[PDB]
Amino acid sequence: DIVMTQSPLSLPVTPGEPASISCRSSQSLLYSIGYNYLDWYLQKSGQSPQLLIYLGSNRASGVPDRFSGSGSGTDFTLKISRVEAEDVGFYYCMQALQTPYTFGQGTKLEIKRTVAAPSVFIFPPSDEQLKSGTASVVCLLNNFYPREAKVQWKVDNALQSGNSQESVTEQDSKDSTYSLSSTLTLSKADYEKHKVYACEVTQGTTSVTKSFNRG
Amino acid sequence: EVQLVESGGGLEQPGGSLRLSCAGSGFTFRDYAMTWVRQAPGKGLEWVSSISGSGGNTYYADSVKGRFTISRDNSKNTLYLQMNSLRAEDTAVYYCAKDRLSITIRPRYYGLDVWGQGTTVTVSSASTKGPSVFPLAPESTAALGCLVKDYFPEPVTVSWNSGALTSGVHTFPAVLQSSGLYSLSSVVTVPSSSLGTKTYTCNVDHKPSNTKVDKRVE
């Protein structure tokens, strides 16, 4: 099977700057003069892949002028002349010379931007949920940059460990920010025992705390 | 426009079987090779199988040979994948894609030019479970959301106001809980002045359990 490899795997870029993603094949993809069987695909968060380039250099229907493919044989490059915020996503090369068709590992295009502090919101468990014997407390960090942020849960000022999970959106296509939600899971019994619920969000040496009183 | 619409994804036991379907419109289906590509959770793309326009030839990844069988019904413009002897490695989103023109003496390649929306296959020994949907109730900006808790398998989709509300929506990646069930939250930020006037409803779909719930967030 033809092995496809990409460089880099992560590509931080400032909007307006060029980007280059490279693909190497273990075998020549030149079927005959003018015909290299190499494609490029984009996959945005929560979307299906979409064709960008086929046969090395042909630009697919509706793909912006800004995208181009070049190369021959075993070496190929996808170029973006000027990166736009909405270009965030994974880029894959694929060979179509032989079955099995084989893909590169994927390159994540990341957009560089200025720092942004999150808007932080805390949500007590719903009355509906509390009927069931479980309590979920949710902390939302909205529209921040960079991705690195520490969330600490405090219950009656006791630091929680091991009872929270978080997940993060991919970069917003317009503003290049992240959002994050963290969920504290307590038994209803434990929830009803305590009063003060706090989510503390730290970037660098700055901490913002949002809290509610159960009572 | 050219569209591929997939169905048939869901949960099966290891060793079990499932059939996927991919219905095409907007092109002369019988003229084109058709292809299945999958993506395991948090992994890249992997080619699975292809079939020529006429069904003259079929092609498979080594790891699926024999166990998987590709087919097509040209009269129904539909591509199928029969997936037998299912293994953990088969857990993935499966995409169908339109492949080369195969009717011509020499096949003509246009890339994988059209892709389906995907269907999720989960191979696990557990049971299907539908979610509970809990409100996340309420600066000039307010945040509200819905917590979609305790479902299996993936995935859940969420929209707001039947798809009308698009700006400021954040639907988070599902988290696998220690219980082996998933939870997902979806939030939106809205003008606080609007909370009295306009309603906000999250539209949750979990196809595996035939759960389709709309929750008004007061």
Residue numbers in the entry:
A (entry chain B): 1 to 215
B (entry chain A): 1 to 138, 145 to 224
Tell me what the authors wrote about this structure, in their words.
By engineering a small secondary structural element from the rabbit light chain constant domain into the human kappa light chain, we dramatically improved the crystallization of human Fabs and Fab:antigen complexes. Alignment of a human Fab structure onto a rabbit Fab showed that the longer FG loop present in human Kappa constant domains forms a bent and bulging conformation that would interfere with a beta sheet packing interaction. In the case of the FG loop, this consisted in replacing the septamer human sequence HQGLSSP (positions 198 to 204 according to Kabat numbering) between the structurally homologous T and V (position 197 and 205 respectively, according to Kabat numbering), with the pentamer rabbit sequence QGTTS (positions 199 to 203 according to Kabat numbering). The resulting mutant is shorter by two residues, with deletions of histidine at position 198 and proline at position 205, and is referred to here as ΔQGTTSΔ (positions 198 to 204 according to Kabat numbering).
Separately to the crystal packing analysis we have observed that the C-terminal interchain disulfide is rarely ordered in Fab structures (in only 20% of the Fab structures in our internal database). This could be due to conformational heterogeneity or to heterogeneous oxidation. Neither the K126A mutation nor any of the disulfide variants (not shown) produced significantly more conditions with crystals. Nor did the disulfide removal (C127A + GEP*) or the conversation of the interchain disulfide to an intra-heavy chain disulfide between Cys127 and Y229C (ESKC + GEP*, Kabat numbering) appear to impact crystal packing or diffraction. Structures were obtained with the intrachain disulfide ordered. The temperature factors in this region were higher than average as is seen in other structures with the interchain disulfide ordered. All structures derived from Fabs with the ΔQGTTSΔ FG loop on the other hand packed forming a beta sheet between the G strand of the kappa constant domain and the G strand of the constant heavy 1 (CH1) domain. At the time this suggested to us that the K126A mutation and disulfide removal might have an advantage, but subsequent results with dupilumab Fab indicated that the simplest ΔQGTTSΔ version was as good as the more complicated versions.
